[PDB]
Design a protein around this ligand. Structure first.
Ligand SMILES: Cc1cc2nc3c(=O)[nH]c(=O)nc-3n(C[C@H](O)[C@H](O)[C@H](O)COP(=O)(O)O)c2cc1C
Ligand SMILES: Cc1cc2nc3c(=O)[nH]c(=O)nc-3n(C[C@H](O)[C@H](O)[C@H](O)COP(=O)(O)O)c2cc1C
Ligand SMILES: N[C@@H](Cc1ccc(O)c(F)c1)C(=O)O
Ligand SMILES: N[C@@H](Cc1ccc(O)c(F)c1)C(=O)O
Ligand SMILES: [Cl-]
Ligand SMILES: [Cl-]
Ligand SMILES: [Cl-]
Ligand SMILES: [Cl-]
Ligand SMILES: [Cl-]
Lengths: 184, 185
């Protein structure tokens, strides 16, 4: 059941050393590709990073940026990150077998909405395929974009480290949906 | 059998039956969506289920007005696409759908819009599982629609998802092959 897939899917920030077959990622992208999009532009573009040096570069730029983020973060954000024991360290950027970088075509109508919708599909597909991921959002997208020679027409949306999950931490809670009717 | 089949089958539904699906069907989709990840697990989505005919009509007309102006002004690829598909500013599905599921994002949440749109992906697949149809309807201006439903300032209307039973919807548009590159561009 889809609900079961969605319910079971949780963040995975720790991956097995073994690299999943590319076919599983490609499957998930093919699923994502079936998603709707503004003017059916299919404004998602995928970059699968496997190169260890490059992952290392991405890891390092992201961590350097996160370091600053963590130095300064405060309030509610800080409290949540602290309670969940996040730090600037993002080893999964190096250690995940794949970094799936998801880009949006800037010029496409509702490109961002569409890509993120498709990421929803993507994540469910990864779960279906028994892969883990985390939508990792670097503090500074541009540095990562440059690392991979992102064309100006594309916008990096998210870095999805993908791999076999490795003793992932538990899914965080979900509050029940509380619907409203007609108006607030 | 596979999620791909579900995703592949799912397509826009702009033609709805009047017949009201059980609320539980729609709530199921929200429950699925709600299992989605989100920035700081904020679960920044909020759902407003519009069923009231008068309000649907108000929403419809506000959107249509906005669309009408937009159709007068749209240019480039979107205009070309809309024209070739014979889209117009009229949005009858906003009246015909038994539900308008208004999906809001909690503005203050980190990556709130990204997260909500991600969850909408879930949501659409769930609707498909339940045999419901929808369309992520995005009028040019949400502000008037937000006001119609007394949207709190903290929330951003992201999308109007008319939801109902499909009434012989038009076929799915094609999909280009997914575009996958390795390591760098
Ligand atoms: C972010 C987003 C916004 C959309 N906005 C509209 C809209 O305003 N009006 C509409 O008729 N369809 C809208 N759509 C539906 C798209 O036109 C549709 O997903 C695309 O044509 C592909 O349809 P298909 O899956 O049936 O091939 C939107 C879709 C997305 C993802
Ligand atoms: C838009 C978005 C951005 C995210 N950014 C990050 C991130 O930068 N770092 C991270 O560790 N997790 C990130 N996540 C993962 C969230 O922390 C995670 O989805 C949330 O904690 C719920 O996890 P759960 O599904 O395992 O309960 C992001 C999730 C989304 C949807
Ligand atoms: N929102 C306008 C234009 C439009 C239509 C379809 C779309 O996919 C889209 F992005 C935009 C409409 O519904 O006609
Ligand atoms: N990007 C930062 C902060 C962060 C972490 C988790 C999140 O869900 C999020 F939105 C933001 C990190 O990975 O530590
Ligand atoms: Cl996650
Ligand atoms: Cl659609
Ligand atoms: Cl939490
Ligand atoms: Cl916002
Ligand atoms: Cl239709």
């Amino acid at each position: 059941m889809l609900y079961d897939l969605a319910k079971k899917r949780k963040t995975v920030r720790r991956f097995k050393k073994e690299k999943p077959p590319l076919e599983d990622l490609i499957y998930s992208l093919k699923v994502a590709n079936e998603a709707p999009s503004g003017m059916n532009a299919q404004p998602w573009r995928f970059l699968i990073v496997e190169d260890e040096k490059l992952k290392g570069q991405i890891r390092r730029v992201c961590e350097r940026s996160e370091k600053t983020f963590y130095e300064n973060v405060r309030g509610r954000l800080k409290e949540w990150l602290d309670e969940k024991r996040f730090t600037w360290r993002k080893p999964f950027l190096k250690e995940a077998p794949y970094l799936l970088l998801v880009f949006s075509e800037k010029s496409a109508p509702y490109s961002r909405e569409s890509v993120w919708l498709a990421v929803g599909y993507l994540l469910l597909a990864l779960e279906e395929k028994g892969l883990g991921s985390v939508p990792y959002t670097p503090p500074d997208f541009r540095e990562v974009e440059k690392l991979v020679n992102t064309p100006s027409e594309l916008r990096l949306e998210v870095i999805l480290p993908v791999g076999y999950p490795d003793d992932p931490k538990p899914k965080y809670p979900r509050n029940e949906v509380i619907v409203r009717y007609n108006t607030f």
